[PDB]
Amino acid sequence: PVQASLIMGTHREADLSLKRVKTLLNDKGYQEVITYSFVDPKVQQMIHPGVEALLLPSPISVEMSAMRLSLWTGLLATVVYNQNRQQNRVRIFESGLRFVPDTQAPLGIRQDLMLAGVICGNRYEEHWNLAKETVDFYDLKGDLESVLDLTGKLNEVEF
Amino acid sequence: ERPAAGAVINEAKEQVQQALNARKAELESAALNARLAAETIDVSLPGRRIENGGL
Numbered sequence: 616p617v618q619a620s621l622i623m624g625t626h627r628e629a630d631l632s633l634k635r636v637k638t639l640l641n642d643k644g645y646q647e648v649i650t651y652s653f654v655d656p657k658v659q660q661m662i663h664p665g666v667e668a669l670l671l672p673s674p675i676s677v678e679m680s681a682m683r684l685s686l687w688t689g690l691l692a693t694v695v696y697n698q699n700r701q702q703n704r705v706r707i708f709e710s711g712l713r714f715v716p717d718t719q720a721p722l723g724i725r726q727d728l729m730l731a732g733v734i735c736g737n738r739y740e741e742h743w744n745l746a747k748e749t750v751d752f753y754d755l756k757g758d759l760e761s762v763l764d765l766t767g768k769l770n771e772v773e774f
Numbered sequence: 775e776r777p778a779a780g781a782v783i784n785e786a787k788e789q790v791q792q793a794l795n796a797r798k799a800e801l802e803s804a805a806l807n808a809r810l811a812a813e814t815i816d817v818s819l820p821g822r823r824i825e826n827g828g829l
Contacts, residue, residue: 637829644824706827739824 633710636730636762640708643758645732648707650689652714656681659688669714669724682714682724686731694735704736734758 655678663684674680686709694705710730717725734755739745763772
């Protein structure tokens with residue numbers, strides 16, 4: 616075994632763990648998802664029209680030739696994928712980088728870590744004592760307020 | 775002996791009032807038990823919750 620020193624390193628109580636936020640999203644009915652960082656620019660153009668994305672010369676395919684400007688192309692492709700398999704209710708999230716061309720950013724591309732998600736279908740599964748109602752805006756906002764409340768700064772959030 | 779007669783009669787009235795209270799307690803506990811019986815539920819029915827997700 617390695618013989619080395621035992622030093623603690625520097626902790627910061629003010630840090631918010633991304634894994635802690637994922638745990639909350641799981642406890643709110645969300646499944647984690649991991650999608651490809653390059654997507655079909657046709658689909659992404661339908662979501663972010665006119666926005667030029669960093670394209671891959673010689674890609675693995677045309678449907679994987681555009682670095683994602685957000686996580687919504689991959690997320691929305693995942694619900695459609697599952698809905699083609701007889702699964703209407705889809706509640707998923709993903710963490711990952713977005714790639715937005717920016718001349719003021721290193722390598723001319725700004726790479727930000729994002730937390731995104733999507734919900735659809737009924738609020739709950741079929742239940743003898745829960746009403747069948749399609750999910751709405753204040754359902755997703757309720758989950759987002761749960762996430763933002765972990766910061767202790769929810770009194771300063773604005774929609 | 776008239777004070778002795780009034781003490782025996784009031785002791786009999788207290789014995790009747792004790793049985794009235796004991797019966798009034800039996801009835802209100804019988805009504806509480808009837809409420810408990812009507813409130814029986816199937817404890818095996820699924821609870822209210824949203825499913826847990828995973829990583």
